[PDB]
Design a protein around this ligand. Sequence first.
Ligand SMILES: *[C@@H]1O[C@H](CO)[C@@H](O[C@@H]2O[C@H](CO)[C@@H](O)[C@H](O)[C@H]2NC(C)=O)[C@H](O)[C@H]1NC(C)=O
Ligand SMILES: *[C@@H]1O[C@H](CO)[C@@H](O[C@@H]2O[C@H](CO)[C@@H](O)[C@H](O)[C@H]2NC(C)=O)[C@H](O)[C@H]1NC(C)=O
Ligand SMILES: CC(C)CCC[C@@H](C)[C@H]1CC[C@H]2[C@@H]3CC=C4C[C@@H](O)CC[C@]4(C)[C@H]3CC[C@]12C
Ligand SMILES: CC(C)CCC[C@@H](C)[C@H]1CC[C@H]2[C@@H]3CC=C4C[C@@H](O)CC[C@]4(C)[C@H]3CC[C@]12C
Lengths: 40, 517, 517
Amino acid sequence: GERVQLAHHFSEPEITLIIFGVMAGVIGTILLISYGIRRL
Amino acid sequence: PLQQTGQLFGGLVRDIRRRYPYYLSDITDAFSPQVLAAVIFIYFAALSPAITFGGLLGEKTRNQMGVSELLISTAVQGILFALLGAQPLLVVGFSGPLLVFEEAFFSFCETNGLEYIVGRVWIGFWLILLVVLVVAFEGSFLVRFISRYTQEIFSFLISLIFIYETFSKLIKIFQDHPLQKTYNYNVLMVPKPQGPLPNTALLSLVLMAGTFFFAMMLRKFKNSSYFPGKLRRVIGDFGVPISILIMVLVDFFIQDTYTQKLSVPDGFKVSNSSARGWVIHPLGLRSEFPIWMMFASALPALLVFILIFLESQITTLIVSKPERKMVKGSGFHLDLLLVVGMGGVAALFGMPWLSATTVRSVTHANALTVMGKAQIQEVKEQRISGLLVAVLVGLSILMEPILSRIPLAVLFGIFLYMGVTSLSGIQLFDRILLLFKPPKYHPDVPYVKRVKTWRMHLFTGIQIICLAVLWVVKSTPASLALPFVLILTVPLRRVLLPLIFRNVELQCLDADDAKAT
Amino acid sequence: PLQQTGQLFGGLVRDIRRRYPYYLSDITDAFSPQVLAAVIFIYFAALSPAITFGGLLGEKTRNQMGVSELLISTAVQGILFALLGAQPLLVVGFSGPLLVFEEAFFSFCETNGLEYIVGRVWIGFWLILLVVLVVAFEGSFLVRFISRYTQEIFSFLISLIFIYETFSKLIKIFQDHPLQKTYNYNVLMVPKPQGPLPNTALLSLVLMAGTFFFAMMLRKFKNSSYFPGKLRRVIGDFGVPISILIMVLVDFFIQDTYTQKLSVPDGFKVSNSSARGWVIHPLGLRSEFPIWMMFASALPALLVFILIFLESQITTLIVSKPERKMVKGSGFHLDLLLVVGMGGVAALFGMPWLSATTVRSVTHANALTVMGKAQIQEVKEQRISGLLVAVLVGLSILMEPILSRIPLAVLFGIFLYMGVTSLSGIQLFDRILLLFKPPKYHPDVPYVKRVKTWRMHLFTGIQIICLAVLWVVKSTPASLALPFVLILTVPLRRVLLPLIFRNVELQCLDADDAKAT
Ligand SMILES: *[C@@H]1O[C@H](CO)[C@@H](O[C@@H]2O[C@H](CO)[C@@H](O)[C@H](O)[C@H]2NC(C)=O)[C@H](O)[C@H]1NC(C)=O
Ligand SMILES: *[C@@H]1O[C@H](CO)[C@@H](O[C@@H]2O[C@H](CO)[C@@H](O)[C@H](O)[C@H]2NC(C)=O)[C@H](O)[C@H]1NC(C)=O
Ligand SMILES: CC(C)CCC[C@@H](C)[C@H]1CC[C@H]2[C@@H]3CC=C4C[C@@H](O)CC[C@]4(C)[C@H]3CC[C@]12C
Ligand SMILES: CC(C)CCC[C@@H](C)[C@H]1CC[C@H]2[C@@H]3CC=C4C[C@@H](O)CC[C@]4(C)[C@H]3CC[C@]12C
């Protein structure tokens, strides 16, 4: 970044990949739940 | 296009198959000087509000986000929206409610001692979550309940706000340089003049008035019967560029009198190099970002999604009315998905999110319209114009000497022209003019020949109350509730209006395609 | 009306028998607000030229004739003409050619050491002899040889002169107060500013633009379809007074900026009391008047008679065309006699001779012109308007506090409105517009459908050559030969034109009643 930034365990690509993976998992869970409804 | 298929991502897939077959036509249809004239129009029409909003954002956020970030975000979003969106006539850019939300969120973060840009990153992260569910479940099908009533009320209110801000900038300029009997000839000018100057505000007013006059005269000359028809159409299409060039030359031939000019950042760099870089860490830059605020960002994310969704869908409805001869189709699910996703991604780069602005997209649709031998004949639907506008916005930093000699007064006259020409397609403004006309001079339309004059006046005055209420909300700190008050008009149309009006009267006054019931 | 009776003073009594029976109608027809609006219009439209020409005449003749003398002469001649003339719609006052003759005669008297005012008295004495003989022998029967050709050429030339001088006054205002980076805050204001002043020229331009814009807007609102018809037409008739009031209030609310105002004499006194009095002795004031100059004044008397005769008679032709719905009659013989006699009488009092000016008379006639539901319906032919204008011009000295708060820029916009509305009744102007139109857009008129396009364009181009030559004549020191050059078009129409144009083409293109041959 710029100036002095706090050091984190995960770098920016790593943390954004983790966040995108969590978001994709939540979206997939919601879609699968909706697929479960309206069938039984 | 507004039908609900019931399949996951059903609207997104159909919008792809509706427009992408016309991708070859979306490039070949731009081979005309009218497309270039529209490019020159929309370039300034999107750049000047972008520059103003970037300056205000830098002032109000301590330069965490400024002119350069907004310019880069606007260029990227315009390029990707023109290349991939199903409605290439839309213009995506910053809006007023977005600025109000950013001001409120910056104040909230300052009060709580939290990092503002990381909060924006997390809100944009939750923005991507919201849009995918809406697109998957076809949540963009609710806009079919937004009839001509709400669309025209929103368009009229937005045009009124546009004209009011255009006049307010001139009023502020006049206040900055009041007409005095004596002046101090030794006034510092960098970065802005620190005192009143002679002939400045008056020359700005003259430039604005001349710009508006020349633009209107050339627009009338397009419909006139002078000069050869091909040359007449060519001159009329370039009416705004010709007027802008004329007023720029007029100001350039005047050296002594100072006029405020367009200002852009020197290079492609962040506004505050000591605050943040091009990439902002979601975990915190200076301090560890709190865990609770990551989840608590959903409600501001919900507000931002509501704002963007309403603005973009209403703009797409307005630019794609059946009376405007849109014979290529529009995609509500694809455009919304692209806009919200680009905003969420650009939040990670420290850039503001955007929305399909009403005024700029309405002007872009109207600038591309070709009239018949009074009657709309066809519209030059193509993706080249928006792509070129976004490219020129991105390159506006590199062409500073061209922009550095352009006064804002010319842009003020252009904005007034856009505001007064954005009302052609609104029946609400037409009926407001009928409030000052005798009944025998009313046009032969279904809502006049089948509705009593006092009934039509009452129906028009009902909307005037709604317009006044919306204007009051804008003039209050809680101006972020404006979309909710706008949504409340739909229950008024579907519930309260039938209690006082008949079905035939409602069909005549509010027709989705301007038909005789 | 132009026929020769063959009886001594036959044309004089015939004009007396034509209009004087309608005398009771000439008073009753004026009881309407449109007449009052016309009075308000023509009051400024005749006072401002009177003030400007009086100032110029006093500057060029060392105040031997000045603003007060011109105002008094205007009042007296206007009252006598409105109470006795057979074309009361004519406006009597000073004109440019008369000023040029005054300058030339002052130079001639100064070179030869002659008394200028006594020479004027003798010339005015010779004027009474000339017009009595001409009316007795019906010399006004030669006016029938002036067709639409010469009438339209003279009207177009005079309108071009008026508009060019209106713009040249603005150019002079800009040059006197140029746009500068710095100004001297200590500049003497009495009697006029001695240096450039801030915000002066720009505010004058703003006032002129606003006045012309609002006058045009209210004229358009007269023919629009807004408001109830009675109120709409009342406002449209009072468009000029309302625009004047709005712009006067706008200038009044700006206090710091200096704007040039109307200046009237302090009281009813001669401009130079050290040179002459109210009555000038024809035998000489300071030195004995030479005998030879008493007889040598006949040639300048002939030149002045030609100028006044041609000006007033062509103005009477223009304001009393059959197409203008003047159904009460006009007197060529009586009005010429009255005008020249009043000029000769005013010469004895040291006051300038006057003639019917084209611009003011045509504006006065158009102010009382009633448009049908487009098509000219009727003209409020009445004597009260001219009499009231003369009375108000005479009383302009006593109303100094009101006239001292009116800027010249508002009057400049009024002059621009008069100039652009003076071109309506000219088919030459209409044919000029056809030079920039495709032939299919040309209107369905007899001179287009019966004559080939290039023949009509050549006919228009020949007239423009005459107009350009007359423009050259005006911009040359021999500007007193202008009526002779205008007369030279009468041989052009009746001799040279038939050699290159067919009889049908000449009948269609130059028609006294706009008929199809
Ligand atoms: C760039 O950001 C820095 C901080 O990130 C700003 O520095 C702060 O400025 C404010 C305003 O006076 C004050 O709180 C302090 O002077 C600074 N605080 C800290 C913690 O540094 C700086 O002003 C910003 N630059 C611009 C042009 O706004
Ligand atoms: C009024 O008239 C007198 C004389 O006609 C003017 O006095 C003359 O002024 C000019 C200008 O300098 C010079 O010829 C002499 O100073 C004067 N000559 C004579 C014969 O007196 C006087 O200037 C006029 N007043 C105004 C205001 O123009
Ligand atoms: C809609 C999108 C933004 C996902 C919703 C956010 C929630 C479910 C997820 C996304 C990323 C997650 C974070 C990822 C990594 C870490 C670091 C760890 O040491 C503590 C938990 C923490 C801080 C997580 C907290 C929960 C979190 C914020
Ligand atoms: C055409 C009009 C002006 C009349 C014609 C003018 C000639 C013919 C007449 C009119 C008045 C006359 C003058 C009247 C009085 C006198 C005084 C006398 O001691 C000498 C002759 C003299 C000076 C006359 C000369 C001739 C004269 C100038």
